[PDB]
């Protein structure tokens, strides 16, 4: 798999900017998560969704293009978390 639990990323959902996030472990409450897809935790807002690799940008490579402040609520908080408290 391209990603594993604990890897940091910018995750992209329709209607939102490329958002600081991480790959979580699969919840024990969930039913099997599809082959192509990952459980994402978004820093700042602390939402989850399932997303595929086309929407996941490794954090290191990508921080120059995406890791900059944003007006959307929770984003700058999220930036802080990904650097300083990624758990």
UniProtKB/Swiss-Prot annotation:
Signal peptide segment: none
Function of the molecule: Acts as an epigenetic regulator of myogenesis in cooperation with DPF3a (isoform 2 of DPF3/BAF45C). Associates with the BAF complex via its interaction with DPF3a and HDGFL2-DPF3a activate myogenic genes by increasing chromatin accessibility through recruitment of SMARCA4/BRG1/BAF190A (ATPase subunit of the BAF complex) to myogenic gene promoters. Promotes the repair of DNA double-strand breaks (DSBs) through the homologous recombination pathway by facilitating the recruitment of the DNA endonuclease RBBP8 to the DSBs.
Outcome of mutating residue 19 to A: Loss of interaction with histone H3K36me2
Highest rank taxon of the organism: Eukaryota
Protein name per its UniProtKB record: Hepatoma-derived growth factor-related protein 2
Subcellular compartments: Nucleus; Cytoplasm
Family from the record: Belongs to the HDGF family.
Subunit structure: Interacts with HDGF. Interacts with trimethylated 'Lys-36' of histone H3 (H3K36me3). Interacts with trimethylated 'Lys-79' of histone H3 (H3K79me3), but has higher affinity for H3K36me3. Interacts with IWS1. Interacts with H2AX, POGZ, RBBP8 and CBX1. Interacts with histones H3K9me3, H3K27me3 and H3K36me2. Interacts with DPF3a (isoform 2 of DPF3/BAF45C). Interacts with SMARCA4/BRG1/BAF190A, SMARCC1/BAF155 and SMARCD1/BAF60A in a DPF3a-dependent manner.
Domain PWWP: 5-62
Portion of the full-length sequence here: 3 to 89 of 671
Tissue expression remark: Widely expressed. High expression is found in heart, skeletal muscle, ovary and testis. Overexpression is frequently observed in hepatocellular carcinoma samples.
Species: Homo sapiens (Human)
